[PDB]
Design an enzyme around this catalytic site. Structure first.
Site, PDB file in Angstrom:
ATOM      1  N   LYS A  30     -14.435  -6.279 -10.584  1.00 38.96           N
ATOM      2  CA  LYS A  30     -13.544  -6.973 -11.496  1.00 38.96           C
ATOM      3  C   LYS A  30     -13.057  -8.263 -10.864  1.00 38.96           C
ATOM      4  O   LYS A  30     -13.189  -9.343 -11.442  1.00 38.96           O
ATOM      5  CB  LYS A  30     -12.355  -6.095 -11.861  1.00 38.96           C
ATOM      6  CG  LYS A  30     -11.389  -6.746 -12.824  1.00 38.96           C
ATOM      7  CD  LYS A  30     -10.215  -5.843 -13.107  1.00 38.96           C
ATOM      8  CE  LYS A  30      -9.147  -6.561 -13.897  1.00 38.96           C
ATOM      9  NZ  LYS A  30      -9.638  -6.947 -15.238  1.00 38.96           N
ATOM     10  N   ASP A  31     -12.521  -8.149  -9.656  1.00 36.33           N
ATOM     11  CA  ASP A  31     -11.996  -9.310  -8.956  1.00 36.33           C
ATOM     12  C   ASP A  31     -13.104 -10.255  -8.536  1.00 36.33           C
ATOM     13  O   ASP A  31     -12.868 -11.446  -8.384  1.00 36.33           O
ATOM     14  CB  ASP A  31     -11.174  -8.878  -7.745  1.00 36.33           C
ATOM     15  CG  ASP A  31      -9.887  -8.184  -8.140  1.00 36.33           C
ATOM     16  OD1 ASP A  31      -9.510  -8.268  -9.326  1.00 36.33           O
ATOM     17  OD2 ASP A  31      -9.249  -7.560  -7.270  1.00 36.33           O
TER      18      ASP A  31
ATOM     19  N   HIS B 158       0.803  -1.217   0.000  1.00 39.28           N
ATOM     20  CA  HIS B 158       0.000   0.000   0.000  1.00 39.28           C
ATOM     21  C   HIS B 158       0.827   1.253   0.000  1.00 39.28           C
ATOM     22  O   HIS B 158       0.442   2.264  -0.572  1.00 39.28           O
ATOM     23  CB  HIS B 158      -0.912   0.041   1.218  1.00 39.28           C
ATOM     24  CG  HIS B 158      -1.993  -0.985   1.194  1.00 39.28           C
ATOM     25  ND1 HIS B 158      -2.701  -1.341   2.319  1.00 39.28           N
ATOM     26  CD2 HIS B 158      -2.502  -1.717   0.176  1.00 39.28           C
ATOM     27  CE1 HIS B 158      -3.593  -2.259   1.998  1.00 39.28           C
ATOM     28  NE2 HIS B 158      -3.496  -2.502   0.703  1.00 39.28           N
TER      29      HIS B 158
ATOM     30  N   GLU C 167       4.174 -35.339  -6.107  1.00 36.98           N
ATOM     31  CA  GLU C 167       3.023 -34.629  -6.648  1.00 36.98           C
ATOM     32  C   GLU C 167       3.470 -33.441  -7.500  1.00 36.98           C
ATOM     33  O   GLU C 167       4.536 -32.867  -7.273  1.00 36.98           O
ATOM     34  CB  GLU C 167       2.118 -34.181  -5.511  1.00 36.98           C
ATOM     35  CG  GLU C 167       2.728 -33.110  -4.634  1.00 36.98           C
ATOM     36  CD  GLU C 167       3.791 -33.620  -3.672  1.00 36.98           C
ATOM     37  OE1 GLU C 167       4.175 -34.806  -3.761  1.00 36.98           O
ATOM     38  OE2 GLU C 167       4.244 -32.825  -2.823  1.00 36.98           O
TER      39      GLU C 167
ATOM     40  N   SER D 252       0.678   0.491  -6.077  1.00 35.07           N
ATOM     41  CA  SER D 252       0.637  -0.718  -6.888  1.00 35.07           C
ATOM     42  C   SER D 252       1.406  -0.567  -8.194  1.00 35.07           C
ATOM     43  O   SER D 252       1.611   0.539  -8.682  1.00 35.07           O
ATOM     44  CB  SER D 252      -0.804  -1.118  -7.181  1.00 35.07           C
ATOM     45  OG  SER D 252      -0.843  -2.271  -8.000  1.00 35.07           O
TER      46      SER D 252
HETATM   47  C1  HEM Z   1      -1.577 -16.025  -1.105  1.00 36.14           C
HETATM   48  C2  HEM Z   1      -0.615 -15.262  -0.556  1.00 36.14           C
HETATM   49  C3  HEM Z   1      -0.328 -13.924  -1.177  1.00 36.14           C
HETATM   50  C4  HEM Z   1      -1.105 -12.781  -1.110  1.00 36.14           C
HETATM   51  C5  HEM Z   1      -2.417 -12.584  -0.392  1.00 36.14           C
HETATM   52  C6  HEM Z   1      -0.329 -11.831  -1.818  1.00 36.14           C
HETATM   53  C7  HEM Z   1      -0.936 -10.388  -2.074  1.00 36.14           C
HETATM   54  C8  HEM Z   1      -0.835 -11.089  -3.679  1.00 36.14           C
HETATM   55  C9  HEM Z   1      -1.819 -10.138  -4.059  1.00 36.14           C
HETATM   56  C10 HEM Z   1      -3.166  -9.896  -3.414  1.00 36.14           C
HETATM   57  C11 HEM Z   1      -1.030  -9.168  -4.764  1.00 36.14           C
HETATM   58  C12 HEM Z   1      -1.449  -7.757  -5.095  1.00 36.14           C
HETATM   59  C13 HEM Z   1      -1.931  -7.634  -6.521  1.00 36.14           C
HETATM   60  C14 HEM Z   1      -3.372  -8.068  -6.696  1.00 36.14           C
HETATM   61  O1  HEM Z   1      -3.723  -9.243  -6.426  1.00 36.14           O
HETATM   62  O2  HEM Z   1      -4.227  -7.253  -7.127  1.00 36.14           O
HETATM   63  C15 HEM Z   1       0.283  -9.713  -4.796  1.00 36.14           C
HETATM   64  C16 HEM Z   1       0.764  -8.403  -3.752  1.00 36.14           C
HETATM   65  C17 HEM Z   1       2.175  -8.827  -4.349  1.00 36.14           C
HETATM   66  N1  HEM Z   1       2.609 -10.024  -4.234  1.00 36.14           N
HETATM   67 FE1  HEM Z   1       1.985 -11.499  -3.412  1.00 36.14          FE
HETATM   68  N2  HEM Z   1       0.763 -12.251  -2.352  1.00 36.14           N
HETATM   69  C18 HEM Z   1       0.771 -13.550  -1.965  1.00 36.14           C
HETATM   70  C19 HEM Z   1       1.975 -14.695  -2.290  1.00 36.14           C
HETATM   71  C20 HEM Z   1       3.202 -14.003  -3.250  1.00 36.14           C
HETATM   72  C21 HEM Z   1       4.334 -14.727  -3.681  1.00 36.14           C
HETATM   73  C22 HEM Z   1       4.660 -16.165  -3.388  1.00 36.14           C
HETATM   74  C23 HEM Z   1       5.093 -13.817  -4.444  1.00 36.14           C
HETATM   75  C24 HEM Z   1       6.409 -14.019  -5.156  1.00 36.14           C
HETATM   76  C25 HEM Z   1       7.521 -13.433  -4.672  1.00 36.14           C
HETATM   77  C26 HEM Z   1       4.334 -12.641  -4.387  1.00 36.14           C
HETATM   78  C27 HEM Z   1       4.865 -11.242  -5.184  1.00 36.14           C
HETATM   79  C28 HEM Z   1       3.745  -9.977  -4.952  1.00 36.14           C
HETATM   80  C29 HEM Z   1       4.017  -8.747  -5.534  1.00 36.14           C
HETATM   81  C30 HEM Z   1       5.230  -8.416  -6.361  1.00 36.14           C
HETATM   82  C31 HEM Z   1       2.944  -7.958  -5.165  1.00 36.14           C
HETATM   83  C32 HEM Z   1       2.686  -6.513  -5.501  1.00 36.14           C
HETATM   84  C33 HEM Z   1       1.514  -6.348  -6.440  1.00 36.14           C
HETATM   85  C34 HEM Z   1       1.931  -5.717  -7.740  1.00 36.14           C
HETATM   86  O3  HEM Z   1       2.893  -4.910  -7.750  1.00 36.14           O
HETATM   87  O4  HEM Z   1       1.330  -6.001  -8.804  1.00 36.14           O
HETATM   88  N3  HEM Z   1       3.177 -12.765  -3.725  1.00 36.14           N
HETATM   89  N4  HEM Z   1       0.378 -11.000  -4.327  1.00 36.14           N
END
Ligand code: HEM
Ligand SMILES: CCCCCCCCCCCCCCCCCC(=O)OC[C@H](COP(=O)([O-])OCC(O)COP(=O)([O-])OC[C@@H](COC(=O)CCCCCCCCCCCCCCCCC)OC(=O)CCCCCCCCCCCCCCCCC)OC(=O)CCCCCCCCCCCCCCCCC
Ligand SMILES: CCCCCCCCCCCCCCCCCC(=O)OC[C@H](COP(=O)([O-])OCC(O)COP(=O)([O-])OC[C@@H](COC(=O)CCCCCCCCCCCCCCCCC)OC(=O)CCCCCCCCCCCCCCCCC)OC(=O)CCCCCCCCCCCCCCCCC
Ligand SMILES: CCCCCCCCCCCCCCCCC[C@@H](O)O[C@H](CO[C@H](O)CCCCCCCCCCCCCCC)COP(=O)(O)OCC[N+](C)(C)C
Ligand SMILES: CCCCCCCC/C=C\CCCCCCCC(=O)OC[C@H](COP(=O)(O)OCCN)OC(=O)CCCCCCC/C=C\CCCCCCCC
Ligand SMILES: CCCCCCCC/C=C\CCCCCCCC(=O)OC[C@H](COP(=O)(O)OCCN)OC(=O)CCCCCCC/C=C\CCCCCCCC
Ligand SMILES: CCCCCCCC/C=C\CCCCCCCC(=O)OC[C@H](COP(=O)(O)OCCN)OC(=O)CCCCCCC/C=C\CCCCCCCC
Ligand code: HEC
Ligand code: HEM
Lengths: 62, 140, 106, 49, 378, 241, 64, 32, 79, 54, 54
Positions: free
Chosen positions: E226-227, E200, E270, E204
């Site tokens: 959208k989501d 935040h 798996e 983004s």
């Molecule tokens: C299920 C657990 C996770 C959640 C809830 C989470 C939050 C998710 C979600 C909600 C976004 C924001 C973009 C969107 O969905 O609209 C993204 C935030 C972010 N996450 Fe995670 N994340 C998770 C696991 C990971 C993993 C394993 C990586 C790899 C390193 C990762 C890299 C990012 C990045 C780079 C953002 C920033 C959003 C952006 O700049 O587009 N996330 N992911």
């Protein structure tokens, strides 16, 4: 032109949110029964004869 | 050489799609070098780098056509598993034009090429099935 | 040492210029560069007349990609036309960063 | 790129702070000797047992 | 007076999910992270309803699983939903990593690293939950994979002895895994909240890659619906893959009860681990296979330092994007090689696939990024 | 190092994505289980519950369950005796211990029916395949005296003697018992036992598709509805100078 | 029995015959000597796979 | 300035019922 | 915070919207998009297809080849 | 809650997983409880705000 | 771990068979009412000084 039945239908239930929720409720109540039984009789109808409910007759009421 | 078409001829059927596709790629490449050869011969490119640009064009295009034709044909053979009827080549025939359609960046020429290249290929297969002689020996 | 061959370099840099899609959106090359904090402060250096132009073009492209539809065929940028305005700014940012570092090392 | 750290003032910082590095590293080494029951260095000191 | 700005908690939600500024030009790829956020809770409740029957005993567990699949009222749906749904979790998760790597949302360093730790956590939860169902693959798989740490010259063989709680897999080791498996997901939640909390306050990423601070747009009117649509369509994927393909997703063999005695023909791990496991085939010395195994996930950290191309993304650079697709293809390679029973050609292909899998990013990407920079005064 | 033979896929009636198992061949295959299929092997996970809805009224399900009786446990003293046969009772215990089966079968325990479809690659079609796979050995290949060569077994030689034969078991239905049709009844019945909820599951699955189809366009229409404001918009730039 | 009837009906097709002769050939390559190493039974597999590949579309043409 | 600004056409995006410049919007609020 | 009330400088750029209700949801939604879809397609198929086709080819390459090292063995092992 | 008619293994399993998850909800709500506490300040034995003397 | 069957035998598994198992279960069982020793006292003082003006 003259308002569509849909148009006056807006002025009815849609514009007021309570009545809107209401028609959502009655609409759910009808969609439930009607679609449910539709899926019933249709599923009964497609792959016919695989059903044992029609094959209950080998063993029911003697 | 005839040995090369002879190489492509032993498909067998359509088994090992790559083995076949490489050969079709080879034939397409050969014809591409010939067409490039006469084209350079009869349309003096001026500035030789442009000439190799030209030959690179035709060679790559015809090679591509041969590749995609070969593999779509054998895949169709290994999927429909009909696998012997002429239509089995025809898709590839139709496919081939599209390849030609892509490089020319034109729906028209690609569309026509689809149909005619398709019919030609279909006739070829039909011919292998029927032993059509094209160049019959004097026999008489 | 390159000289005579340079033509062809330009002959693919243009293809490379085509290779990037920004021309299809018509954006300045300078627009494309990532904003780390120093280059941001270089952005701060810009005159308003040049600044708002940049901002507007960027918003145009941002609207396009939301529609996914590309900027119109006529408007697409030429390789010459894209002024590289940020050059003094960034090159001074480099000179100054490497400056204060150059003192920091002794 | 990484040449900026490669300076006499920083190599100076290296010469200044190295003994301290040996200090804390030895401290955590001894902590490994103790908390983990690292008997191999417990064996180096007779007083144990 | 203002209601959302009244209550401080509401102030927080309004700083976020109600109306955080967002880029407008976002595509579905960014919808995927939100899809992860969708899957997570679903697995949690699903696993809760499953946790209303499953036992962690060496003996009594499998009978209780049979209690699930046959006794429970529509619980079979739940069983497959937890399984297949986890599968979907990894599905979306992989796309998500691909996105963050592709549009360079890894530029948000701390956010990125929390993503990494979150990734390892998910991997562990995966493995252990996979051990739980208690069957042939469960047993021999857990045994074999656990054995890997014994590659350590001293500590690791000791350490396996410590996990197992005994000489071998047993109610000790099984209950162990049941508990770790349970405790981690809740950890994953907090890491998620922390993760967004890093997100935040940097803003983004946008599909353009170039900043869209000027084009920031309200969240609630737009991206929420959208989501919602995106989650509903994933719900389609999942429900169609469960009501119409109940079994195929996994590895039958677990369907056999485990025997320390009886030993399975092939013990394929798996599928999400398959590329990882393929790397176990990669080189002589089990130690180095473990090293490269951990390195396969660890290597991601290098990238933000390895990154140097002027894009914050990878869509206006088909050049490096090509290296990218070579790398993705390489992952497909390690995948399918990991799927097959071990063989020599598979061995050499796995070798070069692994070397190139490291070198595209340790060699090709940065340096081609440099020449790409040379072409246009970058 | 030797290959297992790879069973070809066969077009069973339920393999249609809309298709359901019929209660028919499952019933007759159940008659295949009632007698010949007590060589055991097992079905202990599944009781005479499930059998009620598929083909058998409650009193008839119980009637079906008194056919054989597993031991009642000890009560206040009075240990070990036989309860007549409620459906709540399980299928007969194959052996007091499996080890007895191993003594009965050269140490190779005959597997439970319940997962044999689900566990084996090639599944039910494979089970129908191995039943009918008893080809003769070619010259020069060894075999154990108890073994009865069959390529579909991975070790090529299953210990099992072909339980099936022409006219295995006349059905109460009176329908003819060719080894083919009776084996098809077998594996159909197995697939039933393998997936008790299947026929019911398809109905739920089909119903969901309609729901999803209706939902997929409408919600999408609302997305277009709320994003139309952004897609439509025109912007302009008018410098003050 | 209609089962095997259809089996041999599948064997009517030249694929099962060429596989049959090839079967007899490898089987006699092993039969040629008691010392023979070959697992000709593998060729029996190769016979059966195409064979039941033909049975695949016909076995349920047998259904009552 | 305020004078030379203008609203470019949207009729292609407009609903057919309101597509023309003469009709009441309020007449169409109900159907729409 | 970083909320809208205070952000980047932006000036005499202007917006023209419409009320959603006044406009239909699907303005030529078909005909407009197809050429776009297809152009995006011809744009990136060039950069997407080759890894996957090369993969498929290596797939059948190793599968068929090793299969030839597999089914064909008894002749390869000789008598 | 019983999962059926009697006090059974199913029911103990219920209370098991419930007891086994519920405290995490507790730590969550507790952190929220501090989150209410933050800007509000604390309190004193005197009952007069020590706004001048924190 | 428990069903109906595993139950008290497993709790006793802790009580003896588990290493330090009695240690932990005794800490936990007395950790409860002690947790309440913090608790009802905190509620009591809470009712007293009027910190529920918050
Ligand atoms: C299920 C657990 C996770 C959640 C809830 C989470 C939050 C998710 C979600 C909600 C976004 C924001 C973009 C969107 O969905 O609209 C993204 C935030 C972010 N996450 Fe995670 N994340 C998770 C696991 C990971 C993993 C394993 C990586 C790899 C390193 C990762 C890299 C990012 C990045 C780079 C953002 C920033 C959003 C952006 O700049 O587009 N996330 N992911
Ligand atoms: C049933 C009806 C439901 C309607 C939804 C259909 C497909 C939905 C979908 O998956 O797209 C994402 C769609 C959002 O993308 P979008 O708004 O449609 O496209 C962006 C703009 O419309 C701008 O994109 P555009 O300008 O490229 O628009 C062109 C195209 C959309 O452009 C595309 O890229 C093609 C997408 C549609 C085809 C995909 C399979 C359809 C099923 O839409 C059309 O106008 C074509 C309509 C007819 C489609 C087939 C025509 C054949 C004749 O729906 C979502 O919100 C889900 C987001 C996250 C996806 C995760 C789902 C699984 C996990
Ligand atoms: C399941 C596994 C998870 C991955 C699936 C993603 C979920 C679906 C989704 O995201 O909603 C649709 C979603 C809606 O469009 P969008 O959100 O505006 O895309 C924005 C992208 O960032 C902008 O990229 P893009 O959407 O323009 O993708 C570029 C693509 C151009 O392809 C597309 O834009 C959409 C074509 C898919 C529909 C195919 C025709 C309709 C049937 O060009 C290529 O990469 C290769 C061209 C050859 C594909 C043939 C396309 C037409 C036939 O489309 C996608 O991005 C998904 C990928 C579709 C292309 C896959 C091609 C496979 C061959
Ligand atoms: C996380 C794991 C996966 C989850 C799986 C679930 C997937 C769910 C996806 C389903 C999609 C739901 C769509 C939501 C529909 C409405 C969304 C919203 O955008 O619409 C609002 C509108 O909201 C709705 O109109 C309110 C309807 C009220 C109905 C409430 C449903 C009650 C359900 C209660 C639960 C009962 C079960 C209890 C069990 C214990 C906006 O209002 P507006 O677009 O401006 O039009 C109305 C304007 N008015 C007032 C002037 C008319
Ligand atoms: C085993 C099976 C498991 C299933 C998992 C599925 C993962 C496979 C993903 C493959 C999807 C292939 C479709 C690609 C569509 C495509 O080419 O989109 C084109 C588009 C170009 O768009 P622009 O840059 O905006 O250009 C606009 C030009 N005007 O390219 C992109 O979308 C790239 C962004 C998408 C990223 C997602 C990639 C998915 C692959 C994930 C695997 C890689 C992650 C590796 C991490 C592993 C760590 C342990
Ligand atoms: C709030 C928004 C909604 C959130 C909750 C879940 C969202 C629902 C998405 C469901 C996708 C569409 C699938 C619907 C298919 C369907 O229901 O078919 C009917 C059939 C049952 O009826 P029948 O047996 O066929 O006959 C009538 C019997 N009375 O149901 C199905 O088979 C569908 C199975 C899909 C299940 C998906 C449910 C996932 C939702 C998770 C919510 C869990 C919350 C409950 C936990 C409570 C704890 C506080
Ligand atoms: C359930 C209980 C079961 C427990 C079993 C036995 C428990 C016995 C409890 C008796 C303990 C009381 C001794 C307290 C001593 C004491 O309070 O000294 C007087 C002292 C003087 O205070 P000041 O006004 O500040 O003096 C000013 C001088 N500067 O008074 C206090 O400070 C006490 C105020 C703090 C209250 C703490 C009392 C602990 C018990 C409270 C629980 C009652 C609420 C129950 C609600 C529970 C509902 C879920
Ligand atoms: C010869 C005694 C016997 C007969 C009669 C018999 N079973 Fe078996 N069955 C066995 C044994 C023992 C095996 C496995 C032997 C081995 O794998 O070496 C077996 C194997 C099988 C297999 C495949 C197991 C595998 O590993 O491929 C199936 C399917 C099967 N039997 C079906 C049945 C069923 C159901 C019955 C009714 C109980 C039956 N046959 C009658 C004892 C028998
Ligand atoms: C995303 C993180 C999680 C993963 C990867 C995971 C593993 C998933 C998956 C893969 C299944 C296995 C089902 C099977 O293999 O047949 C299930 C294992 C299990 N998980 Fe988790 N789990 C996760 C979070 C939870 C939570 C939060 C709970 C409880 C509330 C839970 C309870 C179970 C149970 C009982 C099993 C074994 C089920 C079986 O025997 O089939 N899981 N979950």
């Amino acid at each position: 032109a003259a308002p569509t039945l849909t148009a006056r239908l807006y002025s009815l239930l849609f514009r007021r949110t309570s009545t809107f929720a209401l028609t959502i409720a009655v609409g759910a109540l009808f969609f439930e029964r009607a679609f449910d039984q539709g899926a019933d009789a249709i599923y009964e109808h497609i792959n016919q004869g695989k059903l044992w409910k029609h094959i209950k007759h080998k063993y029911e009421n003697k | 050489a005839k040995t090369l078409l002879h190489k492509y001829s032993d498909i067998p059927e359509g088994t090992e799609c790559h083995r076949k596709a490489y050969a079709s790629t080879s034939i397409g490449g050969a014809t591409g070098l010939i067409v490039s050869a006469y084209s350079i011969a009869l349309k003096p490119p001026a500035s030789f780098l442009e000439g190799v640009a030209r030959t690179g064009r035709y060679t790559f295009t015809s090679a591509a056509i041969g590749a995609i034709f070969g593999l779509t044909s054998c895949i169709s053979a290994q999927v429909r598993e009909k696998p012997d009827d002429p239509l089995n080549y025809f898709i590839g025939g139709c496919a081939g034009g599209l390849t030609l359609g892509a490089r020319t960046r034109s729906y028209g020429i690609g569309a026509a090429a689809c149909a005619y290249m398709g019919l030609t290929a279909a006739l070829v297969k039909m011919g292998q099935l029927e032993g059509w002689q094209v160049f019959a020996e004097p026999k008489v | 040492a390159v000289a005579a061959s340079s033509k062809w370099l330009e002959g693919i840099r243009k293809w490379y210029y085509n290779a990037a899609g920004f021309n299809k959106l018509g954006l300045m090359r300078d627009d494309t560069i990532y904003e780390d904090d120093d280059v941001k402060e270089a952005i701060r250096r810009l005159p308003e007349n040049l600044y708002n132009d940049r901002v507007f073009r960027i918003k145009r492209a941002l609207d396009l990609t939301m529609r996914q539809q590309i900027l119109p065929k006529e408007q697409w940028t030429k390789y010459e036309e894209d002024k590289f305005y940020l050059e003094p700014y960034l090159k001074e940012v480099i000179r100054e960063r490497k400056e204060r570092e150059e003192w920091a090392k002794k | 790129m990484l040449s900026r750290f490669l300076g006499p003032r920083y190599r100076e910082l290296a010469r200044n702070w190295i003994p301290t590095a040996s200090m804390w590293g030895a401290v955590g080494a001894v902590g490994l000797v103790w908390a983990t029951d690292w008997r191999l260095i417990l064996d180096w000191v007779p007083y144990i047992n | 007076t203002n209601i959302r700005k009244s209550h401080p908690l509401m102030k927080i939600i309004n700083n976020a999910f109600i109306d955080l500024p967002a880029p407008s030009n976002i595509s579905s790829w960014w919808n995927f992270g939100s899809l992860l956020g969708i899957c997570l809770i679903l697995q949690i409740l699903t696993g809760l309803f499953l946790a209303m029957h499953y036992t962690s005993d060496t003996t009594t567990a499998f009978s209780s699983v049979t209690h699930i699949c046959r006794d429970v009222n529509y619980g079979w749906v739940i069983r497959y939903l937890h399984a297949n749904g986890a599968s979907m979790f990894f599905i979306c998760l992989f796309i998500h990593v691909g996105r963050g790597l592709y549009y360079g949302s890894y530029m948000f360093l701390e956010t990125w690293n929390i993503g990494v730790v979150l990734l390892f956590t998910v991997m562990a939860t995966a493995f252990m939950g996979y051990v739980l169902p208690w069957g042939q693959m469960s047993f021999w798989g857990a045994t074999v994979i656990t054995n890997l740490l014994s590659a350590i010259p001293y500590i690791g063989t000791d350490l396996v002895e410590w996990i197992w709680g005994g000489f071998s897999v047993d109610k000790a080791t099984l209950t162990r895994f049941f508990a770790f498996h349970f405790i981690l997901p809740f950890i994953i939640t907090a890491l998620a909240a922390v993760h967004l909390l890093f997100l935040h306050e940097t803003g983004s990423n946008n599909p353009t890659g170039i900043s869209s601070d000027m084009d920031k747009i309200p969240f609630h009117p737009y991206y929420t619906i959208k989501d919602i649509l995106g989650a509903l369509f994933m719900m389609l994927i999942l429900l169609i893959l469960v009501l119409f393909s109940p079994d195929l997703l996994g590895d039958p063999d677990n369907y056999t009860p485990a025997n320390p005695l009886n030993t399975p023909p092939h013990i394929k791990p798996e599928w999400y681990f398959l590329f990882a496991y393929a790397i176990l085939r990669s080189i002589p010395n089990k130690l180095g296979g473990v090293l490269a195994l951990v390195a396969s996930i660890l290597i991601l950290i290098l990238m933000p330092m390895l990154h140097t191309s002027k894009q914050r993304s990878m869509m206006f650079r088909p050049l490096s994007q090509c290296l990218f697709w070579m790398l993705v293809a390489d992952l497909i390679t390690l995948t399918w090689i990991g799927g097959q029973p071990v063989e020599h050609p598979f061995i050499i292909i796995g070798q070069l696939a692994s070397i190139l899998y490291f070198l595209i990013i340790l060699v090709l990407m940065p340096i081609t990024s440099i020449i790409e920079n040379n072409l246009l005064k970058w | 190092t030797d290959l297992e033979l790879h069973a070809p896929s066969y077009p069973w009636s339920h393999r249609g994505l809309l298709s359901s198992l019929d209660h028919t061949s499952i019933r007759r295959g159940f008659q295949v289980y009632k007698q010949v299929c007590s060589s055991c092997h097992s079905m202990d996970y599944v009781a005479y519950r499930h059998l009620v809805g598929v083909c058998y009224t409650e009193e008839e399900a119980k009637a079906l369950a008194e056919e054989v009786e597993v031991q009642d446990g000890p009560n206040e003293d009075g240990e070990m005796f036989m309860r007549p046969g409620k459906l709540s009772d399980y299928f007969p215990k194959p052996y007091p211990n499996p080890e007895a089966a191993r003594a009965a079968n050269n140490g190779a325990l005959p597997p439970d029916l319940s997962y044999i479809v689900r566990a084996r690659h090639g599944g039910e079609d494979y089970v129908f395949s191995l039943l009918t796979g008893y080809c003769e050995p070619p010259t020069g290949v060894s075999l154990r005296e108890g073994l009865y060569f069959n390529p579909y077994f991975p070790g090529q030689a299953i210990a099992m003697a072909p339980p099936i034969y022409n006219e295995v078991l006349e059905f109460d239905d009176g329908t003819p018992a060719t080894m083919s049709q009776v084996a098809k009844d077998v594996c159909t019945f197995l697939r039933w036992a393998s997936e008790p909820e299947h026929d019911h599951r398809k109905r739920m699955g089909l119903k969901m598709l309609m729901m999803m189809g209706l939902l997929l366009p409408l919600v999408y229409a609302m997305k277009r509805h709320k994003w139309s404001v952004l897609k439509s918009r025109k912007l302009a730039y008018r410098p003050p100078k | 029995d209609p089962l095997t009837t259809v089996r041999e009906q599948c064997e009517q097709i030249e694929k099962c015959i060429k596989a049959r002769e090839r079967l007899e050939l490898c089987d006699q390559r092993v039969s040629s000597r008691s010392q023979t190493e070959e697992d000709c039974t593998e060729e029996l597999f190769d016979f059966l796979h195409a064979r039941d590949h033909c049975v695949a579309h016909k076995l349920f043409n047998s259904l009552k | 300035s305020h004078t030379d600004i203008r609203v470019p056409d949207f009729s292609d995006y407009r609903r057919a019922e309101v597509l023309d410049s003469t009709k009441s919007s309020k007449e169409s609020s109900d159907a729409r | 915070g970083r909320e809208f009330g205070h952000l980047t400088r932006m000036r005499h750029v202007i917006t023209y919207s419409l009320s959603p209700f006044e406009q239909r949801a699907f303005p030529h939604y078909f005909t407009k998009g197809i050429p776009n879809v297809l152009r995006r397609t011809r744009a990136c198929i060039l950069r997407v297809a080759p890894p996957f086709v090369v993969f498929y080819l290596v797939y059948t390459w190793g599968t068929q080849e090793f299969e030839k090292s597999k089914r064909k063995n008894p002749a390869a092992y000789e008598n």
